[PDB]
Amino acid sequence: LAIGKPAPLGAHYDGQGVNFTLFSAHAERVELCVFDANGQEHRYDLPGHSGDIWHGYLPDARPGLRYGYRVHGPWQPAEGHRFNPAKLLIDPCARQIDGEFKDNPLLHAGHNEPDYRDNAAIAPKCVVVVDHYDWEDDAPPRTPWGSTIIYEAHVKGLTYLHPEIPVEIRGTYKALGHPVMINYLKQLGITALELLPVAQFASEPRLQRMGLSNYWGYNPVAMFALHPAYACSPETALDEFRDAIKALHKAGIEVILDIVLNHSAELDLDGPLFSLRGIDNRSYYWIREDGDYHNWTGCGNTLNLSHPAVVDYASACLRYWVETCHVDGFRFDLAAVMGRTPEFRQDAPLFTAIQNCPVLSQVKLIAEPWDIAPGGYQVGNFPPLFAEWNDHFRDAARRFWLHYDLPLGAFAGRFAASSDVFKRNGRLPSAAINLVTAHDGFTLRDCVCFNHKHNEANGEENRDGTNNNYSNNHGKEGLGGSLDLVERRRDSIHALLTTLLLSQGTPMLLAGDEHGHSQHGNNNAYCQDNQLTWLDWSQASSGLTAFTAALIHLRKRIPALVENRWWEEGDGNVRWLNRYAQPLSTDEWQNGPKQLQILLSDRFLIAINATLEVTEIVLPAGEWHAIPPFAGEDNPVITAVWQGPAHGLCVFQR
């Protein structure tokens, strides 16, 4: 093997061979492993070793070359070292994997002693590849944060059962860019399509043994590879995905990738050995004093995102998806791990690396500001470049409309972009990603049809999933029921949807919530790739869809919601009025009836009756007319006193 160069990261062909690079601070020797047409394996030590980077060059190596790594080093259970050359490892920067990660006993690295059985026969291989994709004139929409509306969707579930999409592309990357979806997305009014993880992932062994699979995809095995199962053309999925991205960009729609950098599919010490564990367990992961893993993600392991080599690796990965795939931003799963040096720091290595990266600092950065370990709760403590998922808005809103036990003041707070949380530093209202629901938990519809979760299909006897849903089945457990039950919850769904799309901040709507999508009571469908999870369009509600689309287009017309500036007492952006159209007093905010009016930019008014009985609300001065979707366009009815439904609302304009 030639000496090659200590960069770039991974394997890159240059016309006369391939240059292989691999990081490892504790490896004693690295063997590039190549395979011929007879499956026979050929091994070569990597000549190069600059710093902590091992490198080499294979002259005449052509794209399509299957390879893997074999790393020698200390096998010290107590010190957190797990080097086991008996197991073929994957290049952590591999851009394409060949093979499936099906459960197998040969994969385990070993407990106190390294398992000596060779795993080459059933271990997916990496594939040298070249990218000649022509981007033509694709440019980033760069949509203002003040006019952003995110739509969380699952690549397969979004179009798998869509009647208007050609059967052979449903559930694939190709579908995302088909005229049917692009048109729908545009007419609905969303600006950013956020996809559940698309970095090649595997199904954990525990899932495969239960006859299930990993549906969401929060279990990455190759962070630089595009998940092939969602591709129409697997051996060339990336081209397919980028074609869909061109289309979406042409229609002015952005693409945001949900991504996990906090853990790998290697899970805990009982999980399969794929890469990191055998390349440099000590460096890649957060190890405790006894050599075992720090389980701060609750997934088995936690990448040490503060380690310089890991920061390089991570930031290089994020850069790859932007430069090669042209995504418009990221949504970080269990983001707190990114700031976790031992403790969470807003100035942690990854954050400063992201902020100083000319490319990454230019895209949209969204975080789930926390992890499950003590000190991992970082709501409102992320760098000013990041926006944050506002889970407190999720629960607050649910409690306000479904439980009637939330102070009128707390709700007004959540509606005003949760200032008490983001109103610091140079952060704007848009840092608050408001959501009523998301992939985890109940769909919007199930929040009004179920009091309890029904996760028995997940195989854990309903022990899994959150127990704090703040839901209200309105009378009977389950979908359907009397016309009354149907109308009573339609009022709540309209109210929750309005709260979401009209609140100050960045709205994120969950795909399927516009049309009554249900998961039938399952509130943790992470392992369900079937109906109950896939969007059922043939059964979708056209009425609620239009109701939702009108809301989103109304928003774009309200200055107080699109300017993205904090509202100041009396500046005109908003006024809070009671049931008599009077400024709420001190008492009223504390224990007054849950009824108020929110007039924005003094031309739009939202009337709220969050009590259990129909009431009358006297509107402010002027001639107010209900507007779509609460009334028809060009509505001539002037409302002086609003007859408000129980736990409902209506919007007016003057």
- Alpha carbon distance 496, 510 (integer Å): 12
Look-up: residue for tokens 């407990």? 111
Co-location of 40 and 170 in the same domain:
no
Backbone CA torsion sign across 508, 509, 510, 511: negative
- Alpha carbon distance 385, 389 (integer Å): 14
Q: Which domain holds residue 589?
A: 570-654
Co-location of 312 and 440 in the same domain:
yes
Co-location of 79 and 137 in the same domain:
no
Resolution (A): 2.2
SS3 of 135, please? coil
Cβ atoms of 92 and 313 within 8 Å: the answer is yes
Backbone CA torsion sign across 580, 586, 587, 592: positive
Co-location of 560 and 615 in the same domain:
no
Co-location of 113 and 147 in the same domain:
no
333 a catalytic residue: yes
Co-location of 95 and 173 in the same domain:
no
Cβ atoms of 197 and 218 within 8 Å: the answer is yes
How far apart, in Å, are the Cα atoms of 550 and each of 59, 143, 469? 61, 20, 28
Give the active site residue among 333, 446, 513, 514: 333
Q: Alpha helices of 474-572 — where are they, by DSSP H?
A: 483-502, 542-555, 559-562
Label residues 212-247 b or e (16+ Cβ within 10 Å = b): bebbbbbbbbbbbbbbbbbbbeeeebbebbbebbeb
Co-location of 377 and 525 in the same domain:
yes
Tell which phi-psi region holds residue 529, choosing left (phi > 0), alpha (psi between -120 and 50) or beta: beta
Domain finish residue from 130, 147, 174 = 130
Q: What is the DSSP string of 236-284?
A: GHHHHHHHHHHHHHHTT-EEEEEE--S--TT-STTSB--SHHHHHHHHH
Pairing of strands 150-153, 125-127: unpaired
Co-location of 456 and 605 in the same domain:
no
**In the chain, helix, strand, coil percent, each to 5?**
30, 20, 55
User: What 8-state DSSP symbol labels residue 614?
Assistant: -
User: What 8-state DSSP symbol labels residue 2?
Assistant: B
Domain finish residue from 66, 97, 130 = 130
Give the active site residue among 254, 280, 368, 529: 368
Tell me, what CATH number does 455's domain have? 3.20.20.80
Q: Alpha helices of 126-223 — where are they, by DSSP H?
A: 155-159, 173-176, 179-188, 205-208
Solved by what technique? X-ray
Co-location of 168 and 62 in the same domain:
no
79 a catalytic residue: no
User: Domain count of the chain?
Assistant: 3
Domain finish residue from 507, 540, 569 = 569
